[PDB]
Every structure is written in C-alpha cells, then in structure tokens.
Design a protein around this ligand. Structure first.
Ligand SMILES: [Cs+]
Ligand SMILES: [K+]
Ligand SMILES: [K+]
Length: 14
RNA sequence: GCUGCGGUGUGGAAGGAGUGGCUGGGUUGCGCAGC
C-alpha cells in the first residue's frame, strides 16, 4: 500500500 | 493504489478539507479509520 497514506480533502498529497 | 474525519499543531482557544496554502509550520506535515 505505497500510495495515498491519508485522505479527505487535500490531505496527504505530495 | 484509492478514499473518509478541523480529528492534530512551537496559534489550533474565537477558523476551513485548502475559494489563504508559491504567506508559514506543509510539494497538505501529523494522528485515527475504511476499501
Ligand atoms: Cs491540516
Ligand atoms: K492554518
Ligand atoms: K492548517
């Protein structure tokens, strides 16, 4: 699972 | 690989989910959770 570590709105980008 | 929650703050006690985010912690960091 080496992708988006966290979600919701713009959280966890970059 | 995807997604949800201002839930967290060397401001988080008058805020949001970035219509402030090339103005900072932060190429949206940190925690929790789901597929
Ligand atoms: Cs934040
Ligand atoms: K802020
Ligand atoms: K913030």
């Amino acid at each position: 699972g080496d992708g988006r570590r966290r979600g919701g709105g713009g959280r966890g980008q970059g």
